[PDB]
Design a protein around this ligand. Structure first.
Ligand SMILES: [K+]
Ligand SMILES: [K+]
Ligand SMILES: [Mg+2]
Ligand SMILES: [Mg+2]
Ligand SMILES: [Mg+2]
Ligand SMILES: [Mg+2]
Ligand SMILES: [Mg+2]
Ligand SMILES: [Mg+2]
Ligand SMILES: [Mg+2]
Lengths: 156, 281, 167
RNA sequence: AGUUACGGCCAUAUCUACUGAAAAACACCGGAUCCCGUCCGAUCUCCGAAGUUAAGCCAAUAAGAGCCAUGCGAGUAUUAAGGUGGGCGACUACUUGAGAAAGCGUGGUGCUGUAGUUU
RNA sequence: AGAACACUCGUGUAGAGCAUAAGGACUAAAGAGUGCCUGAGUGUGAGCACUACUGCUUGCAUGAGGGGAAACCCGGGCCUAG
């Protein structure tokens, strides 16, 4: 039978990668955080204070409050077939800034131009949506340089 | 045993570059520079003091993501502008360099007229004048050098304080400290204005005039005597506070690129090997 | 000839081993006379019943001399060994060693309660620049140009004392 | 264009042999009176310039070891969905999709930020 | 003075140690020494582990508090049990 301590089953998780042992780099400490940013959790096994519980490893959430050397992040979780919000305390050594909003922020920068012109000249924005890839395109071909294919390889 | 098998090399992890070179202590650096997440707009300045066989360097440095930025710099070798002839790594030359460094800063920030100089007459920390702008703030970075009573790094630090910058310090480190008694500041003043060396010069002339000439040849060439030092140092300090050194000019030493060696091409490397086989047979 | 690049003594190491009680005090007083230093007592690495040694028990005293004082002692000792050494006594590293059975040959008066002890002498030779491997900042390994080799150590001995190195 | 002080990413930067280097630096180097610390002025701390490019740091060289990239291995190994497909089983063919690794070939061998100094 | 006594020089990515299972962590240290101290303080909040008890993480205020030149750290034991 299995046990139920705070760091159960973390032999693979919570171990350093090959040729990457030691303390964190300066960039870790010089990064500034703000309320409302999206942030991503990855535990560093060498630091023993401010570690989250291993369920949260590799998950992304939103910063709710900022303190001297730690952050409070909001998560959601299913328990007993219902949704529950959870507020997780994490030290700054175990977090990295998330990339999940990157494309959306670029798109907002384009929208922000159009939405002004749409008051002056038009009435409503064109709004620049994405579209999924359509059907295969048409082609005009010169028809020299033909290559033949054959079952010449007998494959003993 | 170890270095005899390939696996030794295949599994090895290198230290960071400035650690291999024995120039930086990363455990110390991180405690010194790490950001406080609530004090937004705080921008801590390190005072970096380093001592070479030739000279004393003071730099004021701010740590930013991507690389440290130098705000201002001063070097004991520049004191030759104000007529310093001798002892560029002396305890006095340490103090003088810290003084110079401070003034250059407070001029850029325009605090210079508010926070006046004060030549080594107390052991208190610099205090914010009411109704005016706050003092410029810094912390001391001594690197890999040891802390002990009367180390030259602390002389430069007192220089900066006397110059008007706010550094927190404890008097435990200066000559003239006593374990359970008031501070004897005349001993400190004595060293700043060079008494320690005068007292050595005076001794040797009674002991061994041959050894004296060997030990102090450079001083002799300047016709300096043990008696002259206080006047020398008083003038030097005043001049630092009073004057300003001329700006540096920029020049293209680009043409010295003639001296740079260039690596062999592939074509050459191959022919060279070919010839080596033929020379051997 | 090229200055630098010339051999010197960097260290002479002297040790007496005498496992037991008041013997170590009696011994220490000898080292305190032969050289103007107070020697360092050393303790047993293992426990060995046959030799009469408990672990962490003091068993020996040593002192390391440098500079001018080293020259006097070495000359004083090589005389006792009559300027005769064997090719066994030299290392691949530029160092050499010998032993003496009777401390009174170094000249000190007997005093019958103190006793008779032997002593080990070990000598380390050098050329300038070795500091590069010992200083705190920018510590690095020395060049092959600046080591001392087995042949050089023999040549120096022959030259300096006119001794005879037997095969 | 190098160097030097403080750095960023942490081997294209490591490890082993050899060889070069104008200027200014960087060093080795000469002492212990003091402050400071040793069994020991070796290390650490202080006060110095008589020497020296031998060393370190920097740079080149090597059908070098190791690291980094790419081509091939290879539509190969394994795998999602499907049928009144096959086989006593062990397991395996086909249809619509996703898709490797080791080895071995070929090329590389640090790049950059702020300030200071040197034709 | 021996297989195995003390002292040295060169190599040495851990082949050692870290009181007590097993795993993880650690190299100018968290290991081995040396100095000083009793923070193994005092009030009162918010949370994490399926969360009552329990264990841990973290906020603000105070001490004629500690260690350190200082930045920093400390309301038990390197982390996961007693
Ligand atoms: K069981
Ligand atoms: K253990
Ligand atoms: Mg599980
Ligand atoms: Mg030159
Ligand atoms: Mg003395
Ligand atoms: Mg010396
Ligand atoms: Mg040369
Ligand atoms: Mg606690
Ligand atoms: Mg704890």
């Amino acid at each position: 039978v299995s046990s139920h301590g705070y760091r159960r089953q973390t032999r693979n998780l919570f171990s350093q990668a090959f040729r990457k042992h030691g303390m964190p780099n300066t960039s870790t400490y010089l990064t500034q955080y703000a309320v409302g940013e999206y942030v991503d959790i990855k535990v560093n096994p060498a630091i023993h204070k401010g570690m989250p519980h291993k369920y949260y490893h590799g998950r992304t959430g939103i910063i709710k409050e900022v303190n001297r050397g730690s952050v409070i992040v909001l998560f959601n979780r299913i328990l007993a077939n219902k949704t529950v919000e959870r507020k997780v305390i994490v030290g700054i050594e175990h977090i990295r800034k998330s990339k999940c909003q990157d494309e959306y922020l670029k798109r907002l920068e384009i929208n922000k131009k159009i939405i002004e012109e749409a008051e002056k000249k038009g009435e409503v924005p064109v709004l620049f949506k994405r579209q999924p890839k359509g059907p295969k395109p048409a082609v005009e071909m010169l028809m020299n340089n033909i290559i033949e294919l054959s079952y010449d390889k007998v494959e003993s | 045993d170890n270095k005899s098998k390939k696996s030794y090399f295949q599994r090895f992890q290198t230290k960071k570059r400035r650690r291999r070179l024995c120039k930086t202590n990363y455990r110390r650096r991180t405690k010194l520079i790490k950001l406080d997440q609530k004090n937004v707009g705080e921008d801590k300045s390190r005072l970096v003091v380093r001592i070479t066989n030739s000279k004393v360097i003071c730099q004021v440095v701010k740590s930013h993501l991507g690389g440290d930025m130098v705000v201002a710099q001063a070097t004991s070798a520049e004191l030759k502008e104000f007529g310093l002839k001798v002892g560029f790594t002396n305890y006095s030359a340490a103090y003088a360099t810290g003084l110079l460094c401070a003034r250059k800063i407070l001029r850029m920030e325009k605090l210079d007229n508010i926070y006046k100089p004060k030549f080594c007459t107390d052991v208190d920390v610099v205090e914010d004048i009411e109704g005016e702008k706050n003092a410029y703030r810094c912390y001391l970075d001594i690197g890999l050098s040891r802390n002990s009573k009367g180390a030259k790094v602390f002389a430069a630090m007192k220089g900066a304080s006397d110059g008007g910058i706010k550094i927190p310090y404890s008097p435990k480190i200066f000559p003239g400290y006593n374990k359970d008694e008031e501070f004897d500041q005349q001993k400190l003043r004595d060293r700043i204005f060079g008494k320690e060396v005068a007292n050595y010069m005076q001794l040797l002339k009674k002991e061994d005039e041959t050894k004296f000439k060997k030990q102090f040849s450079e001083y002799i060439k300047q016709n300096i005597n043990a008696e002259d030092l206080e006047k020398m140092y008083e003038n030097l300090f005043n001049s630092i506070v009073t004057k300003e050194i001329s700006k540096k000019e920029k020049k293209d030493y680009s043409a010295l690129k003639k001296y740079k060696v260039m690596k062999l091409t592939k074509e050459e490397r191959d022919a060279r090997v070919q010839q080596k086989l033929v020379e051997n047979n | 000839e090229n200055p630098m690049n010339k051999i010197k003594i960097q260290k002479l190491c002297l040790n007496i081993c005498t496992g037991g009680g008041e013997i170590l005090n009696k011994a220490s007083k000898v080292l305190e006379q032969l050289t103007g230093q107070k020697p360092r007592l050393s303790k047993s690495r293992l426990t060995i019943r046959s030799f009469g040694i408990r672990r962490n028990e003091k068993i020996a005293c040593h002192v390391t001399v440098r500079g001018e004082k080293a020259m006097e002692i070495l000359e004083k000792g090589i005389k006792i060994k009559e300027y005769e050494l064997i090719d066994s006594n030299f290392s691949t590293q530029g160092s050499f060693g010998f032993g003496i059975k009777e401390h009174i040959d170094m000249g000190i008066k007997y005093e019958p309660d103190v006793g008779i002890f032997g002593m080990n002498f070990y000598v380390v030779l050098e050329k300038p620049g070795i500091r590069v491997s010992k200083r705190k900042r920018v510590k690095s390994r020395v060049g092959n140009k600046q080591r001392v080799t087995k042949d050089e150590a023999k040549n120096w001995f022959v030259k300096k004392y006119e001794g005879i190195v037997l095969g």
